[PDB]
Curated annotation (Swiss-Prot):
Residues 22-276 form the Tyrosine-protein phosphatase domain. This is Receptor-type tyrosine-protein phosphatase mu. Homodimer. Substrate binds at residues 185, 217-223, 261. Belongs to the protein-tyrosine phosphatase family. Receptor class 2B subfamily. The active site is at residue 217. The gene is PTPRM. It comes from Homo sapiens.
Amino acid sequence: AIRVADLLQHITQMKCAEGYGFKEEYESFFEGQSAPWDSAKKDENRMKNRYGNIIAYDHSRVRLQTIEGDTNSDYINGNYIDGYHRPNHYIATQGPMQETIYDFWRMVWHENTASIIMVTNLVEVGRVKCCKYWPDDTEIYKDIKVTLIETELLAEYVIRTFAVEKRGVHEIREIRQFHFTGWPDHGVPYHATGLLGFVRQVKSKSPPSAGPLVVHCSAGAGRTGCFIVIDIMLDMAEREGVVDIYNCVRELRSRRVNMVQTEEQYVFIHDAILEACL
């Protein structure tokens, strides 16, 4: 643990010798499958996984209500992750695929999620990273109707507000998608400033009474892990004057494969929390 006051010295020493401290620390994490994922690797679930190597662990996967007469329809490539002092405060997932747009929305509904965090652009370096799973006006995904109700554009992100409805349920829920568009085509942001501003918008706007925050990038590990770690750590820093980033990542990794996918992402988390604390 690092007192937020020794944070700069800590980060600085870790950067010495081209970041030997960080390089070695990051290498201490376990890369790859560290737990069973029998359901994720089922052939019948193969088309629900974006990246075959970034799939959902059994012990923490988010289960779906089996769609009547459909075995295996209880799977979504997503995992629960604890918040500062809130169990299962987040769901780390992959960017929906056309085949999984419905599974995504029904999960959002069933989990009573109010905020969707998207930290990837639709196409990067020529590659499609996530399908457009939301409508520009309105769209009915089987029994879930989604209506775009507002769009707010800011420097490095856009906030899309939706009026979401389920058939036969006399209710209209406001669900906001916080789309961070400021993450570079390569590497990590040059200034953590924008993502920090994005985090506070999510924290401030998110109803303390709703279900877990659904976070996703493309695979649902790197930038998803960055947002989540930064979010939890600001909570700890606030309530304790201490940050424990290493153990936070280690813990997220027990929940889902390779959270915080690169060492550069790992160092960025430190820069962001340091800036926030300064």
